[PDB]
Amino acid sequence: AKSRTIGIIGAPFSKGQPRGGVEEGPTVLRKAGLLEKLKEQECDVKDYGDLPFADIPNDSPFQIVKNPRSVGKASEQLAGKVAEVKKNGRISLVLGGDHSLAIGSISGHARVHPDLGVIWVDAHTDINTPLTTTSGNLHGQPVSFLLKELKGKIPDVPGFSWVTPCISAKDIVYIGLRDVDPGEHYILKTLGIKYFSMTEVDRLGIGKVMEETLSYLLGRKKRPIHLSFDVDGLDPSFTPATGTPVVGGLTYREGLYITEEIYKTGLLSGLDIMEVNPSLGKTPEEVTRTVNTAVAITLACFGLAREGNHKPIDYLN
Amino acid sequence: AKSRTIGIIGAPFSKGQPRGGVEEGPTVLRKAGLLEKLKEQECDVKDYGDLPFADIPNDSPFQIVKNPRSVGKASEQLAGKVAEVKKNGRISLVLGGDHSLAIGSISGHARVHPDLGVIWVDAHTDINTPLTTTSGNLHGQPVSFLLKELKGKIPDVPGFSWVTPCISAKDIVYIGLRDVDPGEHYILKTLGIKYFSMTEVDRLGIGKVMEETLSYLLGRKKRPIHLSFDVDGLDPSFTPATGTPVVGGLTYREGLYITEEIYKTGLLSGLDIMEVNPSLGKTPEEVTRTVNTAVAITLACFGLAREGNHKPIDYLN
Amino acid sequence: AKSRTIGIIGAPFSKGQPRGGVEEGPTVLRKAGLLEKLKEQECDVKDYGDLPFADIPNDSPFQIVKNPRSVGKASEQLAGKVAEVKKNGRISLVLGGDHSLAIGSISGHARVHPDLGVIWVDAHTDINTPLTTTSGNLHGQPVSFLLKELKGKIPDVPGFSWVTPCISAKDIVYIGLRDVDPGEHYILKTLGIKYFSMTEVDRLGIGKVMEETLSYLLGRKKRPIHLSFDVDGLDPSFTPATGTPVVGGLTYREGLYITEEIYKTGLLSGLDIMEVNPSLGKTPEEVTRTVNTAVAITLACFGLAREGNHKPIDYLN
Ligand SMILES: N[C@H]1CN[C@H](C(=O)O)[C@@H]1CCC[B-](O)(O)O
Ligand SMILES: N[C@H]1CN[C@H](C(=O)O)[C@@H]1CCC[B-](O)(O)O
Ligand SMILES: N[C@H]1CN[C@H](C(=O)O)[C@@H]1CCC[B-](O)(O)O
Ligand SMILES: [Mn+2]
Ligand SMILES: [Mn+2]
Ligand SMILES: [Mn+2]
Ligand SMILES: [Mn+2]
Numbered sequence: 001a002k003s004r005t006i007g008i009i010g011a012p013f014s015k016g017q018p019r020g021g022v023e024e025g026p027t028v029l030r031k032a033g034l035l036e037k038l039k040e041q042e043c044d045v046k047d048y049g050d051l052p053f054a055d056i057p058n059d060s061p062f063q064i065v066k067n068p069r070s071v072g073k074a075s076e077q078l079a080g081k082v083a084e085v086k087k088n089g090r091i092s093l094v095l096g097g098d099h100s101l102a103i104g105s106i107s108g109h110a111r112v113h114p115d116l117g118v119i120w121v122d123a124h125t126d127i128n129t130p131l132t133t134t135s136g137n138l139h140g141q142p143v144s145f146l147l148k149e150l151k152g153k154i155p156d157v158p159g160f161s162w163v164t165p166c167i168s169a170k171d172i173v174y175i176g177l178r179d180v181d182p183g184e185h186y187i188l189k190t191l192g193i194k195y196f197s198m199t200e201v202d203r204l205g206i207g208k209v210m211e212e213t214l215s216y217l218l219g220r221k222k223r224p225i226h227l228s229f230d231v232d233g234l235d236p237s238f239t240p241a242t243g244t245p246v247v248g249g250l251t252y253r254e255g256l257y258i259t260e261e262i263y264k265t266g267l268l269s270g271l272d273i274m275e276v277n278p279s280l281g282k283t284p285e286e287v288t289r290t291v292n293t294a295v296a297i298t299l300a301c302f303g304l305a306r307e308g309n310h311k312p313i314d315y316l317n
Numbered sequence: 318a319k320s321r322t323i324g325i326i327g328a329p330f331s332k333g334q335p336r337g338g339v340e341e342g343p344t345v346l347r348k349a350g351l352l353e354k355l356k357e358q359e360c361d362v363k364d365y366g367d368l369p370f371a372d373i374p375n376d377s378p379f380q381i382v383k384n385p386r387s388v389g390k391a392s393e394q395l396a397g398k399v400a401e402v403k404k405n406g407r408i409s410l411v412l413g414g415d416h417s418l419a420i421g422s423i424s425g426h427a428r429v430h431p432d433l434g435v436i437w438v439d440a441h442t443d444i445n446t447p448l449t450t451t452s453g454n455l456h457g458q459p460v461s462f463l464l465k466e467l468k469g470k471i472p473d474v475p476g477f478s479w480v481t482p483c484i485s486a487k488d489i490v491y492i493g494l495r496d497v498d499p500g501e502h503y504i505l506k507t508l509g510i511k512y513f514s515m516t517e518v519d520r521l522g523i524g525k526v527m528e529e530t531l532s533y534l535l536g537r538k539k540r541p542i543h544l545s546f547d548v549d550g551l552d553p554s555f556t557p558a559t560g561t562p563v564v565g566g567l568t569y570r571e572g573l574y575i576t577e578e579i580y581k582t583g584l585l586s587g588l589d590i591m592e593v594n595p596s597l598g599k600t601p602e603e604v605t606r607t608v609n610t611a612v613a614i615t616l617a618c619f620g621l622a623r624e625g626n627h628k629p630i631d632y633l634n
Numbered sequence: 635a636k637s638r639t640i641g642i643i644g645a646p647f648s649k650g651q652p653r654g655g656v657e658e659g660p661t662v663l664r665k666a667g668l669l670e671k672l673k674e675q676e677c678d679v680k681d682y683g684d685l686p687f688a689d690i691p692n693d694s695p696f697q698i699v700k701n702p703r704s705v706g707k708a709s710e711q712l713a714g715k716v717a718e719v720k721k722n723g724r725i726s727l728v729l730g731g732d733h734s735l736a737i738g739s740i741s742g743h744a745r746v747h748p749d750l751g752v753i754w755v756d757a758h759t760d761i762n763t764p765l766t767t768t769s770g771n772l773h774g775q776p777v778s779f780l781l782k783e784l785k786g787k788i789p790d791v792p793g794f795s796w797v798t799p800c801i802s803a804k805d806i807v808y809i810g811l812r813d814v815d816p817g818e819h820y821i822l823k824t825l826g827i828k829y830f831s832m833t834e835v836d837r838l839g840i841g842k843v844m845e846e847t848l849s850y851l852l853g854r855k856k857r858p859i860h861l862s863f864d865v866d867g868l869d870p871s872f873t874p875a876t877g878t879p880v881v882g883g884l885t886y887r888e889g890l891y892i893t894e895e896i897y898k899t900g901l902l903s904g905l906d907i908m909e910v911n912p913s914l915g916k917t918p919e920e921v922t923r924t925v926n927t928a929v930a931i932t933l934a935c936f937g938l939a940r941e942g943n944h945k946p947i948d949y950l951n
C-alpha cells in the first residue's frame with residue numbers, strides 16, 4: 001500500500017548544533033530493529049543507506065552562524081536523496097541527525113511534490129534567520145530557509161546557494177511549541193503561521209488539535225503531508241536523550257495520537273525523525289527510552305494502531 | 318446503601334498466566350487495609366474469605382492452552398461463590414488473581430442478574446479464543462468464553478463444560494486498550510463491540526468516554542453493572558507490579574474518573590480487581606504503589622469522591 | 635503596564651502548619667532569580683522586602699487551634715503591607731510561607747479593591763472553621779475567616795479580632811480540589827461555592843475549566859482578580875517539596891494554562907505563591923523541581939507565554 005511503502009535514508013549529521021552524538025541517531029534507531037518492525041507491519045521497506053557526509057575542514061562561521069558549508073552540503077545531498085526516493089514512489093523516512101537536515105528533506109520532497117503541507121512537531125519553531133539567531137546553531141533556523149515569505153531576510157550564507165524557498169507560511173502547522181525566541185515569536189505572529197503551542201494543546205486537547213491541523217492543511221484539497229518530527233516535541237520524561245529538552249511537552253499518548261491521525265489520512269509522503277542523541281542520556285535506560293519512543297512514533301506513522309491491527313483474512317476460520 | 322454493601326471474595330489463582338505471584342494479590346490488597354478503608358467510607362463489608370483452589374495435578378495442555386482444568390475449575394468455583402454473594406444482596410468484590418477468573422466472576426454474577434452490562438478496564442481485550450491464542454495463557458481469553466456470538470468458535474476445552482456464554486457483544490464496553498492481538502482485533506471489529514482504546518481516550522477525553530459508555534450500556538434501560546478492572550489498564554507509572562504492562566495507559570486521574578462515574582450510577586453490582594502481582598515490582602516501592610493505586614480505584618467504586626464526602630449532619634453545630 | 639507592575643512581599647511564616655521549612659519559601663524563590671526573571675519580562679518590580687514576624691511567646695492554643703496569636707499577627711501585618719502595595723498601583727505578589735497568610739493577603743487586597751474575585755488553586759479547600767478543624771492547623775482554615783456567609787460560625791479566636799469577612803461565597807472559585815474534609819464538603823455544598831475539583835478538570839478539560847471560571851467571575855463586569863496559588867494544587871511529580879502533597883493533581887501544563895489565561899484578562903491584582911517547603915524534598919533535585927515549577931507559575935501570571943513573547947520592535951530589521 002502507498003501509505004506503507006517506505007524509503008529509509010540515514011542522515012548521520014550533527015554540525016547543525018554543538019552537542020556531539022546526534023550523528024549516532026540513525027545507527028541506534030536501526031539497532032532497535034526499526035526496519036524489521038516496519039516489515040512485520042506489512043510495510044514495503046527499501047533502505048537507501050546512510051549518507052556519507054564528507055568532512056569540510058576550515059568551515060569558518062558566517063557571522064555567528066556555525067559550520068555553514070557543512071550544514072549546507074549535508075542538506076543539499078539529502079535533498080537529492082529524498083527526491084530520488086520520492087520519484088521511486090516511496091514515502092521518504094529520514095533518520096537524523098539534527099533538525100537543520102529538514103532544509104534538505106523538505107526541499108527534496110518539494111521538488112517531486114510542490115503542493116506539500118508540513119506538520120512540524122517540536123518544542124521549537126526552528127524559524128530563526130541567520131540574522132535573528134543568538135546561538136548561530138543552524139538546527140534552530142531550517143524553517144527560515146524554507147519560507148517564501150522570508151526571501152530577502154535570509155543573507156547569502158556559504159553552502160546555501162542551492163536553496164530556493166519551497167513553502168509558504170500557510171503551508172506549515174506547528175504542534176508542541178513551548179520555547180520560542182523573541183525573533184521567532186515576531187516572525188510567527190507577523191507571517192500569521194498556524195500553530196498549536198502547548199497552550200492550545202491544553203485548551204483544546206490533542207483530538208481537536210489534530211482535527212484543526214488536518215482540516216487547515218487538507219480542507220481545500222488532498223495534498224501530500226511532510227511530518228518533521230523533533231523528538232524534543234515530546235516531554236523529556238519520554239525522550240530525554242535529546243539536545244534541547246523542554247519541560248511540559250507532548251505526552252507519549254499525544255505523540256501516538258498525532259501520528260495515528262496522520263497515518264489515517266493516507267497522505268503521509270515524507271517523515272523526519274530528528275534530534276535523537278544517544279550520548280545525552282543520564283543513564284543507559286534514558287537512551288533506550290528515547291529510541292523506543294522514536295520507534296513507536298515512526299511505527300504509528302505507517303499504520304501501527306493502539307486499538308490493534310489485523311491482516312485481511314478470517315481469523316475465526 | 319446498595320451501592321456500599323459489599324461481599325469480598327479472595328481468588329488467589331495464578332494458573333491463567335505463567336508468572337508466579339498474582340495469587341498473592343488478595344493478601345497484599347487486604348494488608349493495605351482495603352476492608353477497614355471501605356468501612357470508614359460507610360460501607361457494609363462482609364468478607365467471604367479466600368477461595369481454596371485445590372491442586373489439579375496432571376493438568377496437561379489442550380493444544381497450546383495451559384492448565385485448562387485448573388483455570389476451568391477455579392472459575393467454576395468462583396461463579397458459585399459470586400452467585401451466593403449476589404443472592405445475599407451484596408456487590409461482589411473479587412480480589413484476583415489473574416484475569417481468567419473473570420469467566421467465573423461474570424458467569425456467577427449473570428446467574429443472579431442476567432441483564433448485566435460489563436465495563437472492561439484493561440490494556441488488552443482478553444478476547445482470544447483457544448484457537449486464536451498464540452501464548453495459550455487463559456487470562457488472555459476470558460471474554461471469548463463469555464460471548465454468545467462466539468458460540469461455535471470455542472472448542473470443548475477440559476474444565477469448561479459448565480460454561481454457557483452469558484453476554485452479547487453489545488453488553489460490553491472496553492476502556493484503555495493499547496495491546497490487541499490480530500485475532501482479537503478481527504473479533505473486536507467483526508462483532509462490532511463498543512471500545513475506547515487509548516486513541517479514543519486521547520480524541521474525546523475521559524469525560525466523553527464515560528458519558529458514551531454509560532449511555533451506551535444504560536440508555537435503553539437501567540441494568541446492573543459488572544466492572545472488570547485489570548490494573549494493567551492504568552499506566553505502568555501507577556501500577557507497575559503486574560504481568561503484562563504497556564506504556565501509555567490510563568492516568569491515576571482517569572482511573573478515578575471512570576470508577577467515580579460508575580459509582581454515581583448507583584448500578585455497580587460486581588467488581589473484579591485483577592492482575593496485581595506483588596512479586597513483579599522492580600523495587601518494594603513499585604509493589605506498594607500498585608497496591609495503593611488498586612485500593613484507591615476500589616474506594617472510588619464504593620463512593621470515595623475527590624470533591625469530598627460528608628454525613629447527613631450539621632457540621633457547623 | 636498595569637498587568638506587569640508588581641510589588642513583592644516576602645512572608646517567611648510557618649506557624650499555620652506544623653512542618654518546619656515553609657518559612658524558607660521566599661528565600662529559595664528569590665535565590666532562583668524570580669525578581670530578575672520578572673524584570674527580563676518587561677515587569678516593573680518593586681521589592682517591599684521580607685516581613686519580620688516577631689516571636690509571640692505564650693501563644694497558647696484556642697481549643698485545638700495551634701499558634702492563633704502568631705497566625706493572626708502575621709496575617710494582620712501582611713494585610714497592612716498588601717494594602718500599601720495596592721495603594722501604590724501595583725499587583726501584590728506574596729511569597730509564602732504557609733496558606734494561613736491568605737487571611738492577610740486577601741483582607742489587605744479587599745481594603746483597596748472590595749469588588750475582587752478569588753481564584754483558589756490548591757488540592758484543598760482550606761475552609762475549615764476553628765470548630766470543624768481536626769488538626770488545629772490554621773493554614774487549613776483561611777477561607778472560613780474571609781467568608782461573609784460564615785460570620786457567626788467563627789468563634790472569637792485570639793489574634794483575629796482585626797478580621798472582617800470581605801468575600802461572599804459567590805466571589806470564589808476553587809480549582810484542583812481532591813482532598814476535602816467532611817466539614818469542608820458540607821460548607822462547600824450548603825454555601826453553594828463554585829468549584830472544579832479534579833473530577834471536573836477530568837470531565838471538562840482545563841480549557842473549559844478556565845472559560846467557566848473567568849465567565850463566572852467576570853461575566854457581569856470586569857473586576858480585580860486575586861489568585862491564591864498553593865503549589866500542592868499541582869501534582870507531587872512537579873511540586874514534591876510541600877507539606878500536604880496529594881496524588882493526581884494538576885499537571886505542569888495545566889498550572890501554566892490557568893496562569894496564562896488569568897494573565898490575558900489583564901485583571902490580575904493579587905497573587906499568592908504558597909506552600910513551597912525546601913526542607914521537604916526527598917533529594918536536592920525535588921526542591922529545585924518545586925522551586926522551578928513555582929517560578930514558571932509566577933512568570934506565566936505576568937505575561938510569560940509558551941507560544942513565545944517579543945518586544946514591540948521589528949525583529950526583521
Ligand atoms: N532553544 C531553541 C530555540 N532557538 C534556539 C536556536 O535558535 O538555536 C534553539 C533551537 C532548537 C532546534 B531544535 O528544535 O531542533 O532542537
Ligand atoms: N499481551 C496480551 C494480549 N494477548 C496476550 C495473550 O493472548 O496471551 C496477552 C494477555 C494478557 C492478559 B491480561 O489482559 O489479563 O493482562
Ligand atoms: N488535608 C488538608 C485538608 N484539611 C487539613 C487541615 O485542616 O489542616 C489539611 C490542610 C492543608 C492546607 B493547605 O492547602 O494550605 O496545604
Ligand atoms: Mn527542531
Ligand atoms: Mn526542538
Ligand atoms: Mn486482563
Ligand atoms: Mn491486561
Ligand SMILES: [Mn+2]
Nearest residue numbers: 733756760864
Ligand atoms: Mn492551601
Ligand SMILES: [Mn+2]
Nearest residue numbers: 756758864866
Ligand atoms: Mn493545599
